[model samples]
Structure formats: structure tokens, C-alpha cells
Target chain A: SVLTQPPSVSVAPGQTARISCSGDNIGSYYVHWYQQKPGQAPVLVIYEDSERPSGIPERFSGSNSGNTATLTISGTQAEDEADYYCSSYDDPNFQVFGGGTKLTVLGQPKAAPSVTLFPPSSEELQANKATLVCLISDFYPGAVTVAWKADSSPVKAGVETTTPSKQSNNKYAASSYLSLTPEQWKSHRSYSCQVTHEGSTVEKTVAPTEC
Target chain B: QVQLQQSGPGLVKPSQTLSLTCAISGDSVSSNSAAWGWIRQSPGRGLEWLGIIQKRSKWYNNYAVSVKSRITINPDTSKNQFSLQLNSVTPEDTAVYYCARYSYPFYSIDYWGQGTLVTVSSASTKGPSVFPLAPCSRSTSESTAALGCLVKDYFPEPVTVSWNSGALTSGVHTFPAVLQSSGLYSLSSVVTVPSSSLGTKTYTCNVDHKPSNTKVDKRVHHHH
Candidate 1:
């Protein structure tokens, strides 16, 4: 289901504005939107990334919950006056975009996933270089780089990337590996993985083992 | 994997005209029916649909006015360059154009190009339209996907029925808006294309705004 403007809105340059798109059940687990102003190519303003582009003012932001997706701007400019939109990203295949929202910015300055953890969750391996694997899933078009972090710090070596496998639903999935010493496993600091796709990233963390 | 990238000018003056192109790489253009069209995202915004260029030849011929009106669709075989153009003037037309592949006919942009934006800066008054209703029909079945329709004046609220070929069928629906605010209010209806007849039948959403009795019907050829 596509959403339209509930009530017409107009804003001047330098003032922040907000727009929302609501939809019925289309099984949309992800919602993405783009911003296009006159004379300039549209920039990837908001996706799942919490950070905005360099030079982009903190005025631009995005948030979504349940079925509704929202886009907000803090400072308005004359250039901001244009049609804005809400979209659902399906990299490499499809992107569900709403029928653009008209954002009238007085000027410019705006801002701008799942994983399978390794070591299948049900395994019970002890000693013998017990390896815990993490699988990442639900990402569109897969990732370019994936990193494993130990208690928030990144692991530098023994990292590898593989072609993601297909899942039951229409999405892609991938996996990673980490070795643990039975003693170190007990207090091996929480392990995590952060993957970068396009410019957006997804992360997962696991608690230390109970060995 | 095939990639679609849009290229062209970065700006166009009001009423001066705007044009952009999408280059198809690593794929054969003629192999599958690639429904290449235009999708735009406004400054600090989302996306919107202008129209589509289904077959290469069709776009070259039918959309002539759009071609000159700052809106053009031209496909070059040798370069594999597909172009898009939007004319007129005003700040409202500035947005990014993406090349998409939609399997459904109801207008969905699945694949997109690295967007290109065109700015329209001129004061133009194309006041909205207001008129009468016409006669139409609509219907949805259990074997289908999801479908609904509504009838209204400014706000095409969820109506009970729609015209199908010419019959009235009713159910819970998010009906499209009417003429007064037509573009402001768009009516949409979706019907599950039964497995048995995915590509064989043409399902439509029809409506009639009395007085002027402007009759219009939008149909989708179901593809599962």
C-alpha cells in the first residue's frame, strides 16, 4: 500500500520540517526514503544510518516503527522547497518508494539490518578450540565488508567474506567466525559483527560463554 | 549483477527543460521486458512517479510533448543510454530520476538508478480540477492478492464499491481520491492475480465523477 499527504504542508527556507508515510500491511519490514531538491541530484538522506553525510547539518533525520516511516528536518532553506518521499530499500532488485513528499527548504543542509551470528545458536561444543559462528540475515543485496568486534573493539585478522545464501523469505544472508579458548570463552568479552552495505551498516553482539 | 546508473545534466532553468539518462550495464536491454521509467526524490525528500517508457520504440514516439516540455524519454541502442526529460517551470519539479524495473503493472519502482535531479523554477498556476462523477466498477476475490476502492470529492475516502468492466463490487478498501484534488489525492486498488491467470487477464479500477462525468479506468496485468 502507498501513502499520500494527509494534510498539505508548506515551509520556508531555514526552518525544520517533518513528513511521514503510513501504510497498510504490505509485509514491508524495511522503509527508506530519498530527498530531491531543484537542480541537484537526490542524495541518500536517510536509510537505517543514524549519521548524516559530511557537511549535512544535523537538521535532517529519519525514524520508523511498526508500519510508519518518518523524515524530519531542523533547518529550512529556500532550496528545501521540493517534493520529498518515503521508500523501502530492496538493493539490487527492488525499492518501494512512496509518492514523494513536497519539502520546501529555504536553503540546504540536511543529514542522513540483520545478521546471522556464527556458531549455530543450538550447538553445545566444549573445549577443543570451540568455535562460535555468527550468521547475518535480512540484508538486501548483501554486504561489501563485515567486521567482528570483541566488546566493541574490532578484530583485525582472520576475517573473510562469503557469498550470502538465500533465505526462506525474499532476502540474503551471510556468516562469520571467531575462535574461543575454553577458559577465555567464559569471560571472552561479548563478541559482535558490524557489516557495511552501500553506506548503511548493521551490527550484532553476543554475550560471553558460560563455560 | 546488472547495474543501472543515471547520468545527465545537474541543473535546468525554469521552463528551460530538463533531461537525464540511465545507462544499463552488464545486461542485455532486449532480453527481458525492462519497464524503465522515471522516479524522483525531491530535495531533502522521498520519491515520486512521472510516467514510464515501456518499449523503447513506444517512448521515442508517444512522449513527444514530454520530450520538449523539459521531459524527454530517449533510448540509444549503441550507447545503451536511456534518457528522461521533464519540462515546465517551478520549484516543485526538482527531484532525482531513477531507472526502475517493476514486475507489477499498478506502478511500483523496484530497481532504481543513481538518481539525477531537475529543478523547475517559475511561477505557474495549473490550478487543480473539479468536476462531476461518472459510472464504473471494481471487485476483489479470495483467490486474488489484495484489492479495495472508494469514492469521494476532495478526499476519496474508503468507499464500499468500484467498477469492474462495468459492475459494482464492494468491500473494505483504501479508495483513490477524486478530481478536485486528483493529483493531490490518488486512488489505488490492488487485486491478487490468481495463479491460474497471472499473465492472461487485465484487472482494472474504474471510476466516474458525476456532473462532468469524467470516466477513467486504471488496469493492471497481473504477474505472479
Candidate 2:
């Protein structure tokens, strides 16, 4: 039978985080664990009867009893906050993965980052080549996503974002760049940069006149 | 109860072709209910969905966008097996390949075979060189003598390792071959000899690599 995991789990930093995986009719198969972070594929952390792959940290451990498998993280760290999944081989030659568990490490709480929109130079804008910069600073947890919208519609292309870099004051900063031609830029009534982090959304918008 | 058993050569040369067959059990390769396909995994590139051959009234195939030009998936209904042919392969094509069944509910793969690693190396790019072997060593306690040789820098894997002492004998064990980070393959196999037959017998480690026809043998004499 397929395995199931909790949707999400949250714990304060330095606290223990435990995620349980339940399988039905799992007789004697070994369970494997995988750690999947956003923007990257899942990596096998444990395999072949609780044997951890080389280079994996020992803090991430896996065990199975009866029909349930468990992945225990000893001490939750900011970097340990990611998605974890359990996998096992099923009868009839099939394999399955459990519904992932999202581990959130709650450190010192903070608000959404302050976002600043810097428009392209007038000469560059007049020449039909424009680049917009969205600078996000002073955010906690260091994990955030930046996206662009034009006239309330999502801008799906030409968006580049840097990973959140830790700041000196135990905070995080990141930036997103959106490139647009003058024709596409002026055609939109409004453009905005939306930042999402820690279950909160903050946006900064610019109008045609501002540009 | 359905399973896919895969078998193929491990090593291949540059610009040559690669062929692998998947034998089906408890299911028909020509079954109209599902499609069969090949998938490969590489260190740099993750799981790659290669292609599939499906049948309904007639047979047809679909390929991944990347390898569509040089890939073919064919089925042999009489033998209940299917095969994959990838042409003009290079070292970049080296991977642990697997066969799987893609069934309905969106062509999701539900069954898979154990993976077989294939390496593609050429003489121009650090190909297989015959490495020398050490003479067999004898131990005091158990009737054990070890013999091994290295087949270095070969590609497109599954080099056959055999033991020869001028006669076919049992208890000849070959270890699994390992691939290096430089996209080359090397292997060493050891065979044990009875203590009574130590002085009179000699063993050879024979490596059969088909792609480059570079099969070679290394002889090891029992040494106390």
C-alpha cells in the first residue's frame, strides 16, 4: 500500500522535529528517506534498510516498525527546514513515495521584507530596452520568493531571482530582475513585484507615469 | 506480478550504437492496456524518461524531446519482450538505465526493472587499457587464493569477467565492476583455489569487453 505523511510540521529552533510515515500492508520492505528543497530534485538521504548515503548528515535518521516508518531530525535548524518524503518498494515491481512533509523551523519571528522597485533609466526606457529591479531586504527565515505581475497578469518569462543571502543582523536579503522591452513595458497599466515569505505577501507597484 | 528484467552490454565505444532488451513477466509486451518504456539515471542529469512503445490496434511509439532523433523503442510480441536502440552514443549517454511499464491514468510508470549501468568511452578519450595483474596469493587457514586484474578506462559498461585456469571450474567469483568519475570503467575479479591444487594450478582473469574488441587476460600463479 501507498504511504502517507503529514502535510506540514513546525517547531522552534533547537527543538526536535519528527515526521511519521504510515503505510498499509507493508510487510517486510525497507523504507527510504529523501530530502527535497524547493527548486531542487529530491535526494536519497537513507536507503537499503536505514543505511544513510555517504556525505549525508547523521542527524537525519530513518526507522521502521510494523507498517509505519519515521524520519527523525534531532535538532531543527534554519537550514533543515525543507520537504521530506519516504519511499518504499511495493509488490508487483512498483515503487511509491509518501506525501511529503514540510518542516518549518521557527526562529525569532519577523515581518515581511521591505521591497524597493528601481526603474530603468529614461534613455534605456526610450530605446525600447528596460530592466526593472526588485530589491528585498531585512527578511527573516531567509527563504522567500519574488514574482512579477503586469497589469494584474503574471509575467512568466525573463524573471531572475537570487537565492536569499544571509545578512549581518541575522536577517536575509534577495533581489529579482525583470527584463522588458519598452513596448511591452508601456503597454501594461501597472507592474508590481510580489514577495512571499513566512506565509505573508508584500508587494510594491509602479505606474506608467512613475516609469 | 508484472516485472521487467533488463539485460545488455555495459560498455560501448563512441559513435557506436547501444541496444538493451527488457524481458517481461506476468504481462504481455504487446498488451494494449499499457505502454513500456526505458528510463535512465545519470549523476549530472536526474531521472530521464527516454521513450515508450505502445500498442492498441496497431503499434506506435513516442520519444523524449531530447533523444527523439536517435532513439527507437521496438517490441517483439512473439517473445513478449521489447528493446531500446540508441544510436551514435557518446560518453554523455552513460547512465544506469532501467525499463518500466507506463500504464493508463496519465501514462504513469508503475513497474520498473533493476537498473543496468552503461558506459560509453573511446580510445581517444581514455578508453579501456589492459592493466597487469598480481600473482595469486595463498593463505594459511582456509584453502583460499586470490586473483584479480583491472580493465581500465572503458565505456558503455557490463564488462564480462571470467576465470580461466586452462579448464572450467566452479567457485570462481567475480566482483562488481566500478565506474570512475572520469567517465571510464575499471574492474578487478578474484577467484579462490583449493589449497591442494595450489601448486599445480594457475588462474587467469579474462575480461570480455565487446565495444572495442579489447578483450584481454591476466594470468596469476599461486605463490605461497
Candidate 3:
């Protein structure tokens, strides 16, 4: 069976973590949850997956529904700031990890006006072609127009559309090419491709060389 | 479901040995993987696993018994009682000795003996000193030694005590037959070397407290 969990979770500042854990056949029985600090051995927080260790506080506990288990912390403290992972004794040895999520401790919010630059679609490289092609996939459910630019200069004429990757049915990709001799490519030029999708300017940039 | 109540002498003299015993209630000392273990706690502290003894097999793990310090575990299966011992101690050796169990996993000390604090004082009595009281061991030995120190608090009256030594370093060794007579008790403790390569060492007997952070180096030098 497959294991799935929330792609991302957010906990408000000073709030406890309400992390949910689920697996196809995991919650039918005992579910174990462990707290991994920045570095140290995994202490037995809960045993038989739920019973709290003698010295552990009641702040940590587990609850499950049909096939989903969740580990909750009553009062999240700064010291409780490590990543929390859920595991089961399903195979006794093998354990899987969730798509990485970072727990961001928010700081002061600030704003200062500044100019930002990006790459154009023409700078993307094609696998089999001698030149680089900058491109975009289907915009998410909206009207869109793609623009090609080089270092703040507009060069919009050439554009090519391609089928989206099969894995994502709702998306379509497009590209443009920029060909230059090896010697001319070294001179240094910048390119950016911006797509105005649903009134949002989504842009991608490519630099001419690693140097 | 079972509980252990340990009662023994409160103090032992330096150059003199200390003994303690544990009495078990509501449990069989023979069945159910129920073995007796000894651990020491400091004046006020956590736990330290010394060793364990299988009540049925008499098989023992003796890493805690000092080569210089003597220890003994006697399980009177009939009486459902067990005893522990420590020897050749100094003032720093004073500690509350406990009899515990190897009940939990990864060598866990699940059950504990209500401790008896044995304070190590200057020698109160003298006994015959026997040479070569223990088995010869190597200084680099990794095998756990069974010191089997004695328990001094078992009697209604006092007992005569004795001292002995042998070629040993850091592994635990057990000796047999201590004389307890005329309101006095005595028993021979085996001094197993943790390592025998450190030779010609001297082990002084004293009462030590657990979490005492007591380290005896002279006991380690007696090995081959």
C-alpha cells in the first residue's frame, strides 16, 4: 500500500503541532511517532506506539482515524522546534519519509522597493539541439501570454509550443531557441522569459555561462 | 506486579568489606526470567547497571564488581531472597547499593531494590588477609567478570569478615565460602580483572555509594 501525508503543513507561532500521519494499513493497529532533535538518539516517547514513556510529559500523544494517525503536541515550545516524523512497525525495519517540509519560524515582515530581473524562454537548452530553448508549461487554469526578453530588452518574435509532460494533464509547455557559437556564447548575455498568467507575472531566467 | 524491599547495613569500613541483601515478595525468584541484578545509586542520583544473575541458572553478569571491590550474589531459592556484596573499598566507595532486575530490553533495569546506604568508614575490624584470592586474568580482557561481593546486612548479629587477593585486572571473579560465626560473618570475594596486563596491583576494600563516580585503579593493576 502507498503512504501519503500532507504535502505541507503550517503551525502558527506559539501553537502546538497537529501533524497527521496516514498509511494504507498503518492505523488498524499500533502507530508510533518519534521526535528527532537536531542530533541525538531517538528517545522512546511512546511505546507499543502510544503509551507514553515513564519520564515523558503528557504534552505528546497520538490519535488515529481508520487509516490515518496524527501526533499532536499540546504546547509547542522553542525547544520542540525539531522536525517530527511518524513511523510504524509495519515491516519492523523499513520506514519512509514525507516530502521534505521546512518549519519556518517567522520573523519581522519588511518591505523595500527594488528592481528584480529574470531569464527569458529563449535561453533554455534543448536536449538534442545545438542551441538553448527557453520555455513554459501550461499555466494553471487561466489565460496567458509569454514574453521573451534579453537583459531588459524585448525580443519576442520566435516562440514554439510543445505538448505538456504526460504526467501532468492540465499543463502545456512552450519554448524558444537562442543559438550562438561557443566563442560568442562566452561574451556574456542574460535572458529572461516571463508569462503573464491570470494577471500574475511568472518569470524564469537562465544565465549564459556558469562562470 | 511484584515489589522488592531491600534492607542491609548502613555503613562499611575502608579496608573492610560491605554486604547487602534484597528480599522479594509476590514473585518467584526461580521462574519468569526473574533474575536479580545489582545497581548503585549515588547519595542522591540516577541508576547504574552493575550486573545480573539468573536466579535459576546461577549464571551471572559481573561487570560492576570491582577487581579491587568484591561482590557476591547469593539466591536462596528456598527463601525467595538474594544478596549482594562489595569489598576492598575506600570512603569514596560509599553508596546506596541496590538489587535490581534485567527485566527490560537492551539490558534494561526494570525492577529495583529499595536501597540500603552503606557508608564507607575507616576500618572497624581486622581479618586475615589471603593472597591469590582470585583467578588470574588479562589486562585486555573484554569478558565480564563476576565479583560476587557479599551482603553484610543479613544477620540478626554481626559476623567475622576476611580479605583476600589474586592475579586479576578488570573482569569479575567470584570466590566461595566466607565464614560467619560467633555473631560475626565472613565471605571470600573473587577479584576478576577487567584487564590482566596491568600487573602487581593492590585492591583496597571499601563501601561505595552509587553515582559515586568512584574509580579504583589499584585493583586493575593486579592482572597478568
Candidate 4:
């Protein structure tokens, strides 16, 4: 297994964020942490597990115990929104870096996401395949994942989902499409678009619209 | 023995609605003994009281004036949780949102969720909204009066601030524009003119955002 980290973490303003790096060789060697922003180079924030580098704030500290090393951001601010990465020496050899953790410093209040799904159209069926489009909107802090299921079973082939896009109201919206053949369209009665965004998943299902 | 747990997206897209759910632990969401509501904070606009989802006899509702039209707070009995829905929010709506339990006597918040920052993300260009506060005739410091204006919600960053006349340049002061929680920019510019010079001449505060075509003009009169 590789050094692992949560894909993302969300914190309120001034809330504390403790991001953990776990796997083999965690506490066995010194661990360092880095901060990254859009289009910029990653900069070191913590060095040698629990040590802070010059110029970094006191709120950004590091610690390790047992098999995990962590970067704890105390009193986090909106400015702290960025990707955090942790790394350590693999003893006698290479260095290992965790697969970056995205820290989303939430500002607007988290709200529910309204989800809607539309089945394939007749024109698409004439073109030989059906495209199911799922519309997900009205959520905040932009962290949401979409999945597709056909007739209650997982369907991953030819599935496309867009990254969260900003809406006019400052909330977030996204779109996902599941491609199917015209023959399969009539065969499947229940097609579900599952949206996983922070703690709960909302699933919206639609039936056959065309044949 | 009431505990609140919140879950929702941390970043909301501009123009979209925001939604969050507060799950109740060891307590009922519709308990008559307890109350539920939402609250939020920002370093700039702190402590905005959203509204209450008081699931009373007929599930009554009340909301803050500002958000009444765009906000909807309700209880989900099926999940024993309460939800907050705010629509068409802008970057100014960015803040730490919290779902709190109400009423020591039903007046104070007792329990609060770990809170979520629902930041709205910004998109491409547009003209900014401007607010020009009337100028002051007296600074109390004597000699000069202060004139100010605020430019908000513009994108693409670079902006310019000027005056109607070049003579007022000496006391002109303006800091860089500030980026909002989601998208867009906000800036405040001010010019102080000597009392003798402003003795009657009206001063116009001009703010020019990124788009040259977009310009703002606010005339400030002398008011001691």
C-alpha cells in the first residue's frame, strides 16, 4: 500500500483541520508537509514531523504517533484553502508522498443539492445510442462525486461527469451522463444518478423516456 | 443530551443554491423541548442569523428579512435532521455556516454542529456594483473633508480609482481591491480635500473597474 490521505477535507473558518497521512513507514521516519495552490509550486510548511519551517504560521504544525503522521491546521482560515501533501523517507531509500489532500475552507453555508435526471431522447435512439443526463445543483464548497447505476447495478462504461461548476448564485452545480444503447434503454427501467457530496449521498432515478 | 452533526458541500457555485443538513444525535429533530435553526459568520459580515425551522404544531416557519425570499429551512423527520436551503447566493454569502440547537429558554443556542464553510466560487467577467457614500464636510481634524465610495462584485482584478479633478490627488488613498469569498472583487477608495478647497466645489469619486466601458461616478457634496 502507498502513503494515503483523504482526497479532501472541509473546515469552517477558524476550525481546526487535522489531515492524516497513513500507511507503511509513517512514523518510522521524519515526515514533512507542503502546501500547494493553483498554478504555483508546492511550498514546505512542516518539516521533520512536528517541526515548523521559518515563515510558516504557528497554526500549521506537524505531529506523528504509531503509524500515522498528521498536519494539523489550527484556527483555519479561508486563505488556507489549498492542497496539502505529506511525505516521508522510506528508510534507506526513496521518499513517499501522500496523494495530496484538498482543504476546502468553506465560506458560504453548506446547503442541500437539488438533483434531477433526464432519460435518453428519441433522436438519440435513432442515432443508435441513448444518453442519460443527470443534473445536480445548489450545493456548496464544491465537493461532490457522481456515479451511475442501471437497474440497480453499477454502470461505469461510457459515463462522463463534469467537475463542479460555479452557478450564478455562488453555489455549485454539476452534470453527469450515462451512455447506453437504444436496445438497453428499453430493457432498463431504473437508471439512477448517485451524487456523493460530504457525508450523504443523494440518488435520483429516472425511467425510460424513449426507446 | 442533544448533539448536532452537519453535512454538506464546503464550496457552492455562484448563482446556485446552498444546502446543508444537521443530524440530531440523542435528540429528536422535532422535539418540542428543543428548537433548531441556522447561523453563519464571516470575518467581514459576522453572525448572520438565517432562520428557524421550528417544527411546531403545524410546522410553523419564520425567516430573516434579507434571506426570506431565497431561504427555506425545514425538518426531515425521516432522517431526524433539519436542512437549510439558501438560493442564489453570491460571494458575499460566503461564511462559516452552522446548525445550532436553540433555547436555553428557547432563546440561546445550546448545541452547534462543527459548522461548514460554504464558499461560492466565482466565474468570468462582469461589471461591478458600486456604492458611493455621500462625502463629509468635516473630518473633525479640521481643514479637510473625507469622500469615499465602494466598488463591489467585479472580476478580472485590475481596477482604477480617480477623481473629477486632478487637484484632489494629494489626499487620495485607495488600497487594492479585495477578492470575495467566492468570486469577484471589492474595493474602497477615498479622497480627502482641504476645507477651504471643498468650500463649495462638489467632488466626484470615480471608480473604474477592469472593463474600461464600465465606470462609476458618485458626486460628494461638502457636509461639515
Candidate 5:
């Protein structure tokens, strides 16, 4: 069975966000719901139709009407802003997921974060290794994705991005480290640090520096 | 001995169809232990599970609701492979597509083929170029033959570096790629072989960068 999801939907805070999933030839299978925040793995919120996974709050609920299923978030909060996906079993052998819906919780005051990229220091490069740091600060609600790019290419491996940690004033801060060898730290090469939060993407590019 | 090889295009225009095939080795598409499927990664969208086709009494197919209307999973029994066809793709559909096998019971992916990047934008119809980087360096100490590859100056940033050293008594050790100062990336891997067979065995480093639409192999053959 094929499943379809909307690209995005928005709702005001304290309102309800309803994400719908439609399936073709879906038979009698149960639909599942997953919530995915930026830069994080999909968390199973609802499974086997209306059953809530452990640790999930009661405000989240699931339902199915024939081949179409719906995940309803009652009293949506700022934290409810994320991507939602639905899943279902097609046959005994295979299962499928919905395209995913980006749920924007509107009417909330959101703060944009600042991101800075720093190359490895001279002492660190002297050891034949290079470390690039993406320092993120002042983000509210604390959910952000920090990714590294070399030139125009995105870096997927050997990137250590930390979870948002709370600062003294309740603002969020986080960092991502990209490690490389000295040979990869050439001056002509361009590196970018991208931080995505609350539907916005901020990027900072730094070329090789004498270190 | 199980291996999965993936093949597909790096670019597709809007409203056109996107196709990909996964060549299976040492395992049948109808293998009872695993389910074959497609997964894609994009900058906007993280990892998206497309669908799966399994062989049982007959071919059974499943798809993600998002693409259920525009996606198809077909099995090629004669070729011992499976394929995916996506229609009416737009810029949002641009992604790095991967063929993966999900082991049953746990449904955890145990084997993944190198991904193929597909672009829907006409402005950039090509993926990155074959990463022009240094040759892999090999070193032998005692019973081990260590192989290393340093990849740099690539785009679209999805690559697969794998080791092919015949049948190994042990598994190969792979190090994740780290960012380089020059907007390049670097990676290294090693495998230890039996001392007696070291002189006769050939080791290969397979690097697949789909965005560049390139698949390269660097081999080191040992001679007595």
C-alpha cells in the first residue's frame, strides 16, 4: 500500500494539529505515527492504530477511518512543532511510511539562534588532526540541527553534534564538532556550518586558515 | 557472503520519473530472513522510508503513504533484483536514494547499498565529480594488512567506502569520515588477514559517491 502525507501544515499554539495519512489498497493494517524533530531520529508516537507508545503523553492520539488514518495532537504546544510521519503494514513482509508533514506551531514567539564556525587551532592541527567546531547559542525552545559541509558538500560522517543544553538564563546552546586530517584542511577549501531551527536555516562558511 | 549493490541515475527533471535498481548477491530478493526496501535522505527531509517488496508465495509490495500514489516496487526475478519507480517528482523529491535490506524480527537494517543522489533541479543536473583524491595507502604489520583511503573535494556529501577482501576470518574496521579544512573529507579503513594468505590476496576499496554519479575502486594486490 502506498501512503501519502502533506508537505506541511501550521497551527497556532494551544490549537490542535491534525496530520492525515492516506493509503491505497491498505486493507486492514494498523497505521502508526512518528514524530521527528530537527536533526533527531523519528520517535514512534503511535503504533498499531490508536495505541500510544510508552512515555508518550495523552495529548497525542491516533485514529483510522477506513484506508485513511489521522494523528491528532490536542492542545499543540511549541514543542509539538516537528515533522510527522505515518506508517502501516502492506503485507506480511513489508511496511511503509508516509512522506511526512512538517507541523509548524505558529503564534509562538520563537528566537533565532546564532551559529559560528571555527577551524582547528594550530596546536591541534600540529598533531595531524583537524577539528571544526560549530558553536550555536541563544536558541529558544532548544531544538536545532547543526550540520557541517565541506565546500558545497554536506558532511555526514564523523560529525559529533550535541543535544541542546540549557544555559543559565534558560536559553539553549549546542555545538557540533567535525574532525578531519590536516591534509583536508587546505586553505582553498570552503567549509560551512549550518544551523537549522524553527523553519529557518543559518549558515556560516569558513575557508582554510593558517593554523 | 551477502551483498547488495545499488544502481541509478544522479539527476531527474521535474514531473519526470525516477528509477533505481538494487542488485542482490548471495541472497534472494525473496529471502525469508529479510525485506528489501528503499530509503532516501535529503537536506530538508532526513531519512524517508519509501517502500518494500518481499517474495513469499508471490510478490507483496508496500509503500509510504506520502508516495503511495506515485511509487511502485517491482521485483525482477530473472535478474534477482528489485527496483523502485517514482513519478511526477519535483524539487522537493530531490534526495539520495539507498537500497537497504531490513532483517526480519528486529526489522533493523543489516545491509545497505551505496546511495544514488537524484536531483530534480534543472540548474544542477549533475552530481559531484569523481572525487579526485589520493590513492589508498596500504601497510602490513604482522598478520594484518591495513588499507586507507582519503577522499576530498566532493559534493552532495553522501559516500560509501567499503572493503572487499574475499572471505575474511574477521570483519573489516571502518573509520568514519571527518571534515577537512579544504571543504573536503577524509576516511580510512583497515582489515587484518591471515598471515599465510597475505601474499596471495587482493584487497579492494570501493568508494561510491552518488552525487558525483561516480563509483571508483582502488585495489592493492599482494605478490610473493
Candidate 6:
């Protein structure tokens, strides 16, 4: 119950940023920090409250006060902008996490995701339902609004999308699924998946093969 | 690429055994490197691990100490499915059951089944009840989301499912009541709707057991 943190923070490139996590009974437990970037699992940054692991940069430092823990990032760069989380092992019943903090480098150019729509396979029509997939990838700030359209009209009932996930190459990728009966798929001339990022939208369309 | 499709009756009478089958696709039940197991969830305990069976140098099995005496997990290579047979069921056995690919070394599940709700009936004649589908929340921006209501262990073959006082018809699928192996009846209904609506409206599931006229209902929210 002692862990607390702000959900987000921002800093300019080449500037310093400090994320603070507050909690009671904080003095009794060791506070650690983890850095989570896109495309990979969170890695340990600070352990034992303020000690850095071998090979960790001096710019990444951890410290603690009477009721708060701090992670200070000096000389912030584009890649240093990530999710940093603080944790305290105060009880065996639970290890408390300070939710997380998203650090943003202000004024960075927003990148748009490339959108691709793949038509459902004929084999998936065996059950009379077809599933279409839309791949969105290679974007920064991976949050995107997804919408589906059939014949220029909105289609909402059959959409399932995953949150943007990271690829090993450091780009972000998200996928969406649209399920409709083969009757509808063949009935409509075209279907489109539109993704809007930073007020700019990219759309991909597919239609059934002409017999 | 492996898939586990769970198949079984969703209702079990008290004092009777509960049996379930998990059919495998794109994988073999007898694969030497893979382990299979059953896990269940209930209100009291979030996730309960029952037992697992695996084929290594030879066949081996391990079970949770809680139900070690009454649990049996067997691989049926003849059918490409692994099976779970729990004996002498009680009301405590009522839970949503899952069949999954397990790591024998780590006691963790990798792949999972779609899950089936199994309610062990109360002693003697009991009223109808409902259980919510767990942990299926997802982004609904572009795909249909599903909600399920299971009616089971009731008498006779007559049962009715209604959504929002019968306001819903399209996308609501109610299956015919099945005569379970134990002679009781079971049926399940599912409704698909736009995911975005989950936050704005509540869906009510009405289960009217025709024999006793016991109409039990549960209101569903985004949490389910």
C-alpha cells in the first residue's frame, strides 16, 4: 500500500528528468527501479534503493528520502524516454509497484504507423465466418485509434484489437481482428481499416477477388 | 500455434463426478516435451491449479495436494485430447474450468482453453444460477466482444435465455439444452456486441428454469 507515482512526466532532450515515488513505511524496504522500453521486457535499473548494477550508466541514478524514492535521468535522450517503475519489497504478501511513469521527450516529431490490411483466407470461411487482420507498425507513441468500414459505412460489432506492442527492432506494432460472416464479406465490395495517429489517419482497404 | 478447445458438460450434480475433455489442435497429446493440466477459478480462490500429466521418458503425473486423492488427468492419444475426471463433486467444485499446456518444471501454463463454466448443483433440488465469463476484456474498437451465460444442472430440458428483457435478438445465440451424462440438463448462451458499448450499457442475462419457474438473472458490466 505504500507505493505511489505520477502516471506521466515530460522533459526536453538534453535536459534532466526526475521521477518521484512516494510511500509510507518506505524507510524499511528497499526501493528498486525498472526501465521498460518498447519491444522488450522491463530491465532492472536500480536495486537496493540506490545501487546501480554493473555497466549501468552514471546518468541513471536512484535515491530515497524519508517517504519518497527518486530516479533521476540526466541528459535525457529520445531512447531514454520510456516507462520507469518503482517497487518496494515491504511485505511478503505483496511487493508494491508505484504504478508506472511514462517519460516523454517534449517536441519530438510524432511518427505515424504504417497500416496493412490482409484479406481473410478462403479456408477461414469454412465456418461461414471470415476474420480479417490489420497490421499497424513502425510508429512512435504507438497509441492509435482504429476503425473499420464496410462499403464506406462504419462496422463496429466485430473488432478486437491488441494494444501496441514492441518489436525487437524498437518499433511498435499493433494488430486488429474483424470478424464477419462470409455472406457480408462477399456482399460488400470493399472493407477498410483506418488508424489515426496524431490527427493524421492512414487507411488500407481490401475487397474480395473477382471470380 | 497450438490450440486447446475445451469440451464438456457445464453442469454437474452434487455427489457425482465431473468430467471434461480438452481437444488439441496443431499439437499432439503424447508429445514428449509438452505437459497438459487442468486449472479452475471460483469466487473464493482466484485460480486453483489441480494437476498435470506429461509424457517424458515415460508417463508421469503430479497434482495439487488439495485434490490429489480425487483428481485424475489422463491423456487420450486415441482422440487427441487430454481429460480431467474429478470424483465426488461438491458445491465447492463449482468453477470455470480450463485445460492448458503446462510447464512441468515451472508450474506455469502457456496455452489455454476457451474455458467452460461448471456449476456443481446444490444438494437436492436447487434454484437456477449464473456465472460470469472471467478476464475476457479486450479492445473492442474493431471486433465483436462476447459475453456468456451458462444455465446448467437444472431439471428437465426446458430453459429460456433472455437479454435485457428480450430487447436483444440479433447476435444472441442460445444453444439447445443438452442432456448431460448424469441425466441433468445444461445449456449456454452468448451475445456479441460492439466492444465500445460495454462501458455505456449493462447487459442482463435472464435464466428462466421452466420447471420451477425459477428465473435467476445477473447484470454484466465491463469487469466481466
The parts of candidate 3 lying over 4 Å away from their true place are A1-57, A60-211, B44-46, B55-58, B65-69, B104-107, B123-224
Error of 5 at B212 (Å): 45
Q: Report the lDDT tens digits of candidate 1 across residue range A118-202.
A: 3312122322343444445555543235788767677754343343444445455555445455454455567777876545666
CAPRI class of candidate 6: incorrect
Better of 3 and 5 by lDDT: 5
lDDT of 2 by residue, A63-152 (tens): 888878888888777888887877666654344667667677876676468675645445445555665656677777666767799988
- Tell me the tens digit of each residue's lDDT in model 3 across A40-99: 322345544466768778877877767777777666555555445554434422223332
Better of 4 and 6 by TM-score: 4
In Å, residue A152's CA in model 6 sits off its true spot by 66
Candidate 4 residue A160 Cα shift, in angstroms, is 2.3
**What is the lDDT for B104 in model 6?**
37
Q: Model 3, range B1-224, lDDT digits (tens) per residue?
A: 66778877786656676677778887766655655667664432223445456644445444442431466667768878777766676655566676765443323334666567776754324332121222222233464332323322122223222223333334332222222212222222334333342334345443221222222211212323
Regions more than 4 Å wrong, model 4? A89-97, A184-189, A209-211, B1-224
Model 4 over residues A1-109: C-alpha lDDT tens digits?
3678876688989999999899775776777787866444356787768867567899998898778888999999888898787766553323345777778888788
- Model 6's TM-score against the true structure: 0.34
Kindly list the per-residue Cα lDDT of model 6 for residues B1-224, writing each as its tens digit.
Answer: 88889999987878899999999998898887678888776522234567778888888887776678899998998999999999998866877787877533432345678888888864344454454431222434566666656554577657888998899877775544443333455555667777777778678888888677787886754443
DockQ of each: 0.06, 0.01, 0.01, 0.01, 0.05, 0.02
Candidate 2 lDDT over B72-108, as tens digits, reads 8889888899998999998668887879886553344
Which residue runs of candidate 1 sit more than 4 Å off their true CA positions?
A: A5-211, B56-70, B103-110, B119-224
Candidate 5 lDDT by residue in tens digits, A48-109: 67877668899999888776788999999889888888866655435666777778776445
Model 1 agreement with the true structure over B79-143: per-residue lDDT tens digits: 87677766564445655566655333322333567666554543222321221111112123446
CAPRI accuracy category, model 5? incorrect
The TM-score of candidate 2 is 0.40
How big is the positional error of residue B139 in model 6, measured in Å on the Cα after superposition? 50
Ten contiguous residues with the weakest lDDT in model 1 chain A:
A118-127
